[PDB]
Structure formats: C-alpha cells, structure tokens
Design an enzyme around this catalytic site. Sequence first.
Site, PDB file in Angstrom:
ATOM      1  N   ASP A 152      -8.993  -1.445  -7.702  1.00  0.00           N
ATOM      2  CA  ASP A 152      -8.187  -1.653  -6.490  1.00  0.00           C
ATOM      3  C   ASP A 152      -7.509  -3.032  -6.538  1.00  0.00           C
ATOM      4  OD1 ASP A 152      -9.064  -1.429  -2.909  1.00  0.00           O
ATOM      5  OD2 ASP A 152      -7.162  -1.049  -3.929  1.00  0.00           O
ATOM      6  N   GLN A 171      -4.653 -17.720  -2.586  1.00  0.00           N
ATOM      7  CA  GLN A 171      -4.824 -16.942  -3.818  1.00  0.00           C
ATOM      8  C   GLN A 171      -5.988 -17.486  -4.641  1.00  0.00           C
ATOM      9  OE1 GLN A 171      -1.691 -13.954  -3.525  1.00  0.00           O
ATOM     10  NE2 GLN A 171      -3.629 -14.192  -4.632  1.00  0.00           N
ATOM     11  N   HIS A 214       0.833  -1.219   0.000  1.00  0.00           N
ATOM     12  CA  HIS A 214       0.000   0.000   0.000  1.00  0.00           C
ATOM     13  C   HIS A 214       0.860   1.258   0.000  1.00  0.00           C
ATOM     14  CE1 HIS A 214      -2.986  -2.982   1.572  1.00  0.00           C
ATOM     15  NE2 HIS A 214      -3.655  -2.421   0.580  1.00  0.00           N
ATOM     16  N   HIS A 268      -6.970   6.867  -2.750  1.00  0.00           N
ATOM     17  CA  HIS A 268      -7.797   5.960  -1.948  1.00  0.00           C
ATOM     18  C   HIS A 268      -7.094   5.217  -0.803  1.00  0.00           C
ATOM     19  CE1 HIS A 268      -6.219   2.593  -4.346  1.00  0.00           C
ATOM     20  NE2 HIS A 268      -6.684   1.826  -3.376  1.00  0.00           N
ATOM     21  N   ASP A 269      -5.757   5.134  -0.815  1.00  0.00           N
ATOM     22  CA  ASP A 269      -5.000   4.492   0.281  1.00  0.00           C
ATOM     23  C   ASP A 269      -4.006   5.443   0.961  1.00  0.00           C
ATOM     24  OD1 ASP A 269      -6.017   1.822   0.629  1.00  0.00           O
ATOM     25  OD2 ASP A 269      -4.874   1.127  -1.113  1.00  0.00           O
ATOM     26  N   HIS A 279       0.844   1.242  -5.851  1.00  0.00           N
ATOM     27  CA  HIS A 279      -0.481   0.608  -5.833  1.00  0.00           C
ATOM     28  C   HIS A 279      -1.569   1.629  -6.206  1.00  0.00           C
ATOM     29  CE1 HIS A 279      -4.206  -1.250  -4.646  1.00  0.00           C
ATOM     30  NE2 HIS A 279      -4.357  -0.381  -3.662  1.00  0.00           N
TER      31      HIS A 279
HETATM   32  C1  LIG Z   1      -1.252 -13.435   0.182  1.00  0.00           C
HETATM   33  C2  LIG Z   1      -2.614 -13.134  -0.461  1.00  0.00           C
HETATM   34  C3  LIG Z   1      -3.606 -14.304  -0.401  1.00  0.00           C
HETATM   35  C4  LIG Z   1      -4.978 -14.053  -1.043  1.00  0.00           C
HETATM   36  N1  LIG Z   1      -5.643 -12.882  -0.475  1.00  0.00           N
HETATM   37  C5  LIG Z   1      -6.349 -13.134   0.655  1.00  0.00           C
HETATM   38  C6  LIG Z   1      -7.027 -12.125   1.323  1.00  0.00           C
HETATM   39  C7  LIG Z   1      -6.994 -10.831   0.815  1.00  0.00           C
HETATM   40  O1  LIG Z   1      -7.667  -9.922   1.503  1.00  0.00           O
HETATM   41  C8  LIG Z   1      -6.274 -10.581  -0.355  1.00  0.00           C
HETATM   42  C9  LIG Z   1      -6.197  -9.302  -0.914  1.00  0.00           C
HETATM   43  N2  LIG Z   1      -6.795  -8.223  -0.397  1.00  0.00           N
HETATM   44  N3  LIG Z   1      -5.504  -9.045  -2.044  1.00  0.00           N
HETATM   45  C10 LIG Z   1      -4.845 -10.033  -2.696  1.00  0.00           C
HETATM   46  C11 LIG Z   1      -4.099  -9.744  -3.955  1.00  0.00           C
HETATM   47  C12 LIG Z   1      -4.507  -8.678  -4.758  1.00  0.00           C
HETATM   48  C13 LIG Z   1      -3.844  -8.384  -5.950  1.00  0.00           C
HETATM   49  C14 LIG Z   1      -2.760  -9.161  -6.371  1.00  0.00           C
HETATM   50  C15 LIG Z   1      -2.346 -10.237  -5.585  1.00  0.00           C
HETATM   51  C16 LIG Z   1      -3.020 -10.514  -4.398  1.00  0.00           C
HETATM   52  C17 LIG Z   1      -4.899 -11.321  -2.165  1.00  0.00           C
HETATM   53  C18 LIG Z   1      -5.602 -11.622  -0.996  1.00  0.00           C
HETATM   54 MG   LIG Z   2      -7.488   0.456   0.934  1.00  0.00          MG
HETATM   55 ZN   LIG Z   3      -6.074  -0.092  -2.430  1.00  0.00          ZN
END
Ligand SMILES: CCCCn1ccc(=O)c2c(N)nc(-c3ccccc3)cc21
Ligand SMILES: [Mg+2]
Ligand SMILES: [Zn+2]
Length: 323
Positions: free
Chosen positions: A229, A282, A77, A117-118, A81
């Site tokens: 986002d 993921q 963040h 936004h962040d 981003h």
């Molecule tokens: C380590 C991530 C595991 C998976 N994951 C679990 C819960 C989350 O809340 C989120 C998140 N907010 N963003 C991502 C993400 C976004 C863009 C590119 C790559 C990943 C992943 C994610």
């Molecule tokens: Mg945010």
């Molecule tokens: Zn964001």
Amino acid sequence: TRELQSLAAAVVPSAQTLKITDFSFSDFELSDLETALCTIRMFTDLNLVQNFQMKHEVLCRWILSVKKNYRKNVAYHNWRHAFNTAQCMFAALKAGKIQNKLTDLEILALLIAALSHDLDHPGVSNQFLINTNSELALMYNDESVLEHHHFDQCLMILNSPGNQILSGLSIEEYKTTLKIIKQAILATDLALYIKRRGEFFELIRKNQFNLEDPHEKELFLAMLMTACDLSAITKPWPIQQRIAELVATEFFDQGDRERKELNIEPTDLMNREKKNKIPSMQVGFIDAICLQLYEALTHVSEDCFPLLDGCRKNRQKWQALAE
Ligand SMILES: CCCCn1ccc(=O)c2c(N)nc(-c3ccccc3)cc21
Ligand SMILES: [Mg+2]
Ligand SMILES: [Zn+2]
C-alpha cells in the site's frame, strides 16, 4: 462495453516485457488498457487463471469493473494507486521471493485484495467521515470505516454477473479466500497497522516469528498489505516525488473541505497554507511508519531489500530538502 472487447481480444505481453517484476516499476507511461494487460499478466503468472478455472472474458470484465469503480478525479486514491499496490504485491511475491511462503488461496486473496483495497475511495479520511456524520461511519461504528466500504465494494464486484472470478472455487476454498480478502483489505487501515505492528516487530526481535502459526501468518499478510500500500515511498526519487504530490493534493483537498464543512483549521498534513511542512512530514512518516516495516519485511525475505533501499534513498532526499 467497448473496453471489454479491446481488452479481451489483446494478446497479453509477458511479465518480462511489461517490467512488472521490478520493484522500481512506474505506471506513469502506461495507458489504462496497458495497466489492464499488466493486471491480467499478474493473475496468469501467479498460477491463478488455470488453477481456479477463471474464464478470460470474466477476468477481463472484473478487472475493468475494479478500474471503473475507483474515482478517477480523486488525486491519489484512484485506479493507479490500486494497480501500483498490486504491482508491488506481484514484485514482492516474485522478485522478493514471498510466493513460495504462501498458499495458493493466500496468493489469490492478496492479489484481489491489493486491486480492490481502496474501491470507491471518496478522497477523504476515516476521521473526516466520522466528523461529517457519514452513514458509513454509523454503519461501521467508526472502526475502519473506509476499509469496510472498500470490502463491501470488493464483494459487490465479485458477485456481479459476468465478473465472478471466484465462481470456480469449491465451497471451502471460497470461504477461506473471502476471509483472507476481508482481513487483507481491513489491514490497509493505517490505524490497524500501528495497532498490530508491535506484535510483529516483537516476534521478529525475539526470534519467535513463525509463518506456520496461523495467527502469525495472517499478521504477516496484514504487514505485507501495508508494505505494498505504501510502495510509492520506496520508488526512485522522481516517481516517489510525483506520487507524493498526489498524496498532498488529496490531503489539502480534504483540508479545504474541513475549513468549509467543519469550520476548523486543518492539521499541517491537510493544510495547503502550511505546505512548507511537506519535507519534514515526509521524513517523519518514513521514520515513524515506513522504515521499520521494510526492515522487517527484508528480515522475512532478504530479496525484499530493494524496497528498504529505495525508502532509505527517499528519506535522504526529503531530509536534504527539510534541513
Ligand atoms: C504529504 C505527505 C506527508 C507524509 N505523510 C504523512 C501522513 C500520512 O498518513 C502519509 C501517508 N499515508 N502516505 C504518504 C506517502 C505515501 C507514499 C508516497 C508518498 C507519500 C505520506 C504521509
Ligand atoms: Mg486505503
Ligand atoms: Zn491504499
């Protein structure tokens, strides 16, 4: 100063040269200055600069102020981003053909919101702020705590002397725009996305979705914000994999803090010791949060399909690692 003089003096290359219309765009090879030039180009090619009488020097100053107020040492963040989020917005409006569906004020608000936004993100979650007795959580009664802070910061920069890119708006246009910005920034709370997306998906499933309805328009804008986002999840595998590492780095950093400050075992997401869970998480995240959103956006505009295509390709890659 210094960066302002360099940024303001520069001839801004075309959108075509900068590749910012491409959904598959990568920031990795660009300097901070180059991302700033890209940002000027987004404003320019969305008919925002002359339309709202933005002074070049003021726009440049504002962009630099926004960049500066991200914490560069926060792994995910940070400015890149926010920049990437704004780039996806630009691409969605252009290549994805969303521009003609929105008002000038909505476009203005979305671009500002995406970039802002962040702002000043501490690299820890709302839940962490609540659990560590953050003054912000108290101020905002535990609701979208970070996002209220990002909005506060957004306003602060917009009102900063020399940075007032909305100073040209009429009183009514200004009111309208600030309201859209607030909603757009607040929308980026994944908690709010999960709460509100059901309505959006239902409307589409029932062939009831109507952009002319003010409420459904703002619902769509919230979903579009989330789509931008989360844009890294749609990128070519090497780009997505690199950014996924940043996301995990930041989450694991929070986990370290949780062990020390709260004496708790972090959840898998925040637990470096259990980093083996990343591929499965993921896949689970793409299924639970991402696919339905990019599917819905493609329903609204077919030209947004490349985001869906990219997301599905990344799901395949992660699942191959997980299984
Ligand atoms: C380590 C991530 C595991 C998976 N994951 C679990 C819960 C989350 O809340 C989120 C998140 N907010 N963003 C991502 C993400 C976004 C863009 C590119 C790559 C990943 C992943 C994610
Ligand atoms: Mg945010
Ligand atoms: Zn964001």
